[PDB]
Amino acid sequence: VFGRCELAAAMKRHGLDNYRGYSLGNWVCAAKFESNFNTQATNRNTDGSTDYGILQINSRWWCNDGRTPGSRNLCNIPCSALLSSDITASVNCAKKIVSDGNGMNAWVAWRNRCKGTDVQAWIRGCRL
Amino acid sequence: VFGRCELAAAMKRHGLDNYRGYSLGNWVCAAKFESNFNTQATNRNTDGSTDYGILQINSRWWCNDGRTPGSRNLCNIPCSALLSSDITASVNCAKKIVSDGNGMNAWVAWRNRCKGTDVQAWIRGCRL
Amino acid sequence: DVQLVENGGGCVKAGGSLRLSCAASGSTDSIEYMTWFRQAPGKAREGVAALYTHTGNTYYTDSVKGRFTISQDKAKNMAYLRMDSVKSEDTAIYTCGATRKAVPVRFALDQSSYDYWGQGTQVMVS
Amino acid sequence: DVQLVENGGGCVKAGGSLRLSCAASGSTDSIEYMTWFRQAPGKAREGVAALYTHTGNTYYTDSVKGRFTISQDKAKNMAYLRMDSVKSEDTAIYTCGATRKAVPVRFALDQSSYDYWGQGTQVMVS
């Protein structure tokens, strides 16, 4: 399980900082409420698609697992890469997801908890 | 080939006389223009139905041949009975056909030639 | 070989008079039955007012009993269905079906018996 | 689990203003997109005006660009499509599709992407 402050630092290093006009707190909160700081967590869906990565990237539109119908693989990154022990693939596909046009509203957890909330509290005290 | 006057006499015996307010001339004319006085004659149709009997009764609605789709078999009489050397089955099913409600107009031959014509000329001189 | 073309229809006020007109061409001599089938949204096609070209006997569904009148002309091979006391339920697409054969009375309103269909015409009730 | 019911429609002559109303029931929280698809006769279903419930961004097909307006209310879970300058080609059956997953913008007009649909409401022009 990734550390919260360490996860924020890694995301800042990756270049996700101030992406689409969103502070690091937004990303930290989204990851925390999506996979509880776990890149190895995966969740099924009724349509058959499976979420992958720390940010829970859905395979039907983002990553090609080969086991979901209508895999549009928009991030064209294998779901295994998101499942990897590093967060590089997760952030790389999340940049495209947020750049889609609707911002971070795509991620359900971000809307539920990280939207219109003191997201800065998540990164507070992380000496970043 | 059935005789004209003998067929008229047999039809009168069977009880078809004055059926649905139609003189024997109408029926004799209709049979002659339908099967040329042949109970064994059969004619195919584009839909797959086959006419049977001297009056050319259609199998799709009257006789169940087992070869025509959607056989209603309203007469419920086998097509072989109409094909028999006797005319009893043909007249028995024609009674139901004419009694359907539309009279003798259902048969194409009757409307083409037997309708609004001197049908009495067909039976004239048969000593019945 | 008869191809069926519909005419009329369109927007009409509740209780108004609408004259749906249908025509036949080609080998129209074989034409036997002319019937209107309404393909209402979310509902399967169903007969409305069966008609016989020669005898002229008119058969109607219980829903349209005493309201719609169907008549045709032998020389103009055209059959038109007048509409009156229209309601919301009448709103549907009417198809001018036809047959080249003498269908029984009980199946006069059954589409499967028929062999010829035309282009669906829209009918609206306000 | 969202069930879509369409409202409005009916008769409007060319140039008239007509409002189509759509509503959501059940688990309306999962709703992400709301789009109208026109099933014109002889033509396959196609998107008309996509929408995002939260952001509110509107995406329109080239044909209906600058004519139709789509908006929604978050407290009522309903989205309506105002139409103006309607023409003959606008005649069709409009379906208020819906989805429970965040579809991409380029696929916002894709019928296959959406996971819910409602009963077809007709739109006709005099």
Residue numbers in the entry:
A (entry chain F), B (entry chain D): 2 to 129
C (entry chain C), D (entry chain E): 1 to 126
From the paper:
The rapid implementation of the homoDiGb method and the additional insights gained into target structure function led us to consider the limits of this technology. Current cryo-EM structure determination methods typically struggle with targets below 50 kDa, contrasting with our ready solution of the structure of 49 kDa RECQL5. We, therefore, chose to probe even smaller targets. Strikingly, within weeks, using an essentially identical workflow to that used for RECQ5 and SPNS2, the homoDiGb method was applied to 43-kDa MBP and even very small 14-kDa hen egg white lysozyme, achieving reconstructions at 2.45 Å and 3.16 Å, respectively. Interestingly, for lysozyme, an archetype of X-ray structure determination that we solve here by cryo-EM single-particle analysis (SPA) for the first time, we found that C1 symmetry reconstruction followed by local refinement yielded better resolution than imposing C2 symmetry for the entire particle. This putative observation of nominal asymmetry for such extremely small proteins may offer strategic solutions for other very small targets as this field grows.
Here, we show that a generic and kinetically biased ‘Gembody’ (Gb) interface, previously discovered through trapping in crystallo, can also be trapped in solution by kinetically controlled side-chain-to-side-chain bond formation in a manner that leads to ready generation of complexes; these display ideally balanced interface flexibility and yet relative complex constraints, in turn allowing rapid cryo-EM structure determination, even of small targets. Ultimately, after a survey of in-solution covalent bond-forming methods exploring differing natural and unnatural amino acid residues, we found that Cu(II)-catalyzed oxidation at a pivotal C12 residue site (together with the presence of needed Gb ‘gem’ substitutions previously discovered through iterative X-ray-guided engineering) offered a route to direct and rapid, high-yielding formation of disulfide-linked homo Di-Gembody (homoDiGb) without side reactions (for example, off-site oxidation) to form a robust covalent interface. Furthermore, the success of DiGbs for high-resolution structural solution is enabled by their relatively small mass contribution to the imaged complex while increasing the maximum particle diameter for better particle alignment. In summary, our plug-and-play DiGb strategy improves cryo-EM resolvability and resolution of small proteins through constraint and increased particle size with a simple and robust workflow and can even enable simultaneous structure determination of two challenging targets in one dataset.
